[PDB]
Amino acid sequence: RLANFLVHSGNNFGAILSSTNVGSNTY
Amino acid sequence: RLANFLVHSGNNFGAILSSTNVGSNTY
Amino acid sequence: RLANFLVHSGNNFGAILSSTNVGSNTY
Amino acid sequence: RLANFLVHSGNNFGAILSSTNVGSNTY
Amino acid sequence: RLANFLVHSGNNFGAILSSTNVGSNTY
Amino acid sequence: RLANFLVHSGNNFGAILSSTNVGSNTY
Amino acid sequence: RLANFLVHSGNNFGAILSSTNVGSNTY
Amino acid sequence: RLANFLVHSGNNFGAILSSTNVGSNTY
Amino acid sequence: RLANFLVHSGNNFGAILSSTNVGSNTY
Amino acid sequence: RLANFLVHSGNNFGAILSSTNVGSNTY
Amino acid sequence: RLANFLVHSGNNFGAILSSTNVGSNTY
Amino acid sequence: RLANFLVHSGNNFGAILSSTNVGSNTY
Amino acid sequence: RLANFLVHSGNNFGAILSSTNVGSNTY
Amino acid sequence: RLANFLVHSGNNFGAILSSTNVGSNTY
Amino acid sequence: RLANFLVHSGNNFGAILSSTNVGSNTY
Amino acid sequence: RLANFLVHSGNNFGAILSSTNVGSNTY
Amino acid sequence: RLANFLVHSGNNFGAILSSTNVGSNTY
Amino acid sequence: RLANFLVHSGNNFGAILSSTNVGSNTY
Amino acid sequence: RLANFLVHSGNNFGAILSSTNVGSNTY
Amino acid sequence: RLANFLVHSGNNFGAILSSTNVGSNTY
């Protein structure tokens, strides 16, 4: 089981970025 | 089971980005 | 079981970045 | 079980960055 | 069980960076 | 108060031959 | 108060041959 | 108060041959 | 008060042949 | 008050042949 | 008297990705 | 009198990624 | 009288990544 | 009278990463 | 009268990383 | 001055091949 | 001055191959 | 002055191969 | 002045191979 | 002045091979 959560509750004036690779062949 | 959640409840004046790769062949 | 969480509750004027690789072949 | 958490509650005017590799072949 | 936590509660005007490799073949 | 965001997230480029200014940010 | 963000997150480039200014940030 | 962010996070480059200015930050 | 961030975090480069200015920070 | 950050954290380079200015910081 | 010629002379291949039986001789 | 010729002469291959049976002789 | 020739002469291969049976002779 | 020739002469290989059976003779 | 020739003459290999059966003769 | 000559005056029952690269960028 | 000559005056039942690179960038 | 000559006057039932690199950058 | 000659006047039932590198950067 | 000669006048049923490097950077 994979769970990927991004939560934002404050005040953002900038950049929030997320990147994920699970069980993959990437190049 | 894969669960991908992005939640936003605050005030956003910027960028929020998410990228995910699960069990894939990517290039 | 994999759990990947990014949580933001404060004031952000900068960059918050996350990168993850689990069980992958990457190059 | 792998748990990867990045938590921010203060005021950020700079860069907060995280990188993770678990059980992978990377080059 | 692996737990990787980065916590920030103060005021950051600089860079906070983390890098981790567990059980991997990296070059 | 002026904020400019130039972002590239989760894009795939297969093969690039004899090209200029590909997938770049210019300010 | 001026903030400029030039970001590259989670992008894949397969092969780059005889090219210029690929996947770069220029200010 | 001026903050400039030029960031590269979690990007993959397979092979780079006879190229210039690939995956770089220039200010 | 001027802060400049030029950052490289968790990037993979497979093979670099006869190239210039790859994965670098220039100010 | 001027702070400049040129950072390299957790980057992997497989093989570098006959190249110049790879993974470097120049001010 | 049986003569079989399978020849490859002066051929250029720029980039080959995820392919099978490229520029080969099979008898 | 049976003669079989499988020849490769003066061929250039720029980059080969995740491929099988490239520029080979099989009898 | 049986003569078999499997020959490789003056071939150039730039970069080979995660491949099988490249530029080989099999009898 | 049976003569088998498996030959490799004057071939150049730049970089080989995570590959099998490259530039070899198998009988 | 059976003669088998498996020959390697004047070949150059730049760098070999995590590979198997490179530039070899097997009978 | 470049002069490229291929001359055949005998009896040919096989293959005669010529390949030439002069002052070029080839891959 | 470059002169490249291939001359055949006998009886050929096999392969005659020539490959040449002068003042070039090849890969 | 460069002179590259391949001359054949006898009876050939096999392979005659030539490869040349003069003043070049090859890989 | 460079002179590269391969001369054959007899009966060949085998392989005659030549490889040359003069004033070059090869890998 | 460089003179590189390979001369064959007899009967060849085997392999005759030559490799030469003069004033070069090879690896």
Return the structure tokens found at S19.
Answer: 């490889």
Number of H helices, E strands in chain D: 0, 3
Contact flag Q15-M5 (C-beta cutoff 8 Å): yes
Q: Give the residue on J whose Cα is nearest the Cα of S25.
A: J18
**How far apart, in Å, are the Cα atoms of P5 and each of F5, L13, Q8?**
61, 27, 11
Alpha-carbon distance C13 to D20, whole Å?
A: 24
Q: CB C27 to CB H14 under 8 A? A: yes
Do C17 and D18 form a contact (C-beta atoms < 8 A)? yes
T25 shares contact with chain O (CB less than 8 Å):
no
Task: Give CA–CA dist R21/H25, Å, rounded.
Answer: 38
Residues 6+ positions from K17 with CB-CB distance below 8 Å: B27, F14, F15, G14, G15, L17, L18, L19
Sign of the alpha-carbon torsion through N9, N11, N13, N16: negative
Cα separation, Q23 vs A7, whole angstroms: 59
Compute the distance between CA of residue K23 and CA of residue L6 in angstroms, rounded to an integer: 12
Rounded CA-CA distance L26/M4 in Å is 11
Question: Residue S16, CB half-sphere, CA atoms under 13 Å: how many?
Answer: 30
Contacts of residue H21 in chain G, CB cutoff 8 Å? 20-22, 24
CA B14 to CA A11: how far, in whole Å? 9
Question: What tokens were used for M14?
Answer: 């730039």
Contacts of N18 in chain I (CB under 8 A): none
C-alpha count within 13 angstroms, C-beta hemisphere, residue T1 = 3
Nearest to H6 by CA among J10, G4, G11: G4
- Give resolution in angstroms: 2.3
The pair of three-digit structure tokens given for residue A19, joined into one six-digit string:
């990147």
The dihedral built from the CA positions of residue N4, N9, N13 and N16, taken in this order, carries a sign that is positive
Reference B26, options A21, I14, F9; nearest CA is A21
Residue of G nearest to C19 (CA): G10
Residues M24, M6: contact at Cβ < 8 Å?
no
Quote the CA–CA distance of I25 and I8 in Å, as a whole number: 8
DSSP state for residue C14 in the 8-state scheme: S
The Cα angle at residue Q6 between residues Q1 and Q9, in degrees rounded to 5: 140
CA distance G15 to chain A (A): 9
Length of chain H: 27
- N- to C-terminal Cα separation, chain H: 18
Strands P2-8 and O2-9 turn out to be: unpaired
Sign of CA dihedral B16, C25, K23, O8: positive
Kindly list the partner chains of chain P, i.e. chains with 3 or more CB atom pairs below 8 Å.
Answer: G, K, L, Q
The partner residue sitting opposite M17, judged by closest CB among N7, N17, N25, is N17
Of the residues H1, H18, H21, H27, the best mutation for testing chain G's interface (the one with the most G CB atoms within 10 Å of its CB) is: H21
- In the stretch 5-24 of chain Q, residues with CB closer than 8 A to chain K read 13, 15, 17, 19
CA separation for the pair L25, K27 (Å, rounded): 8
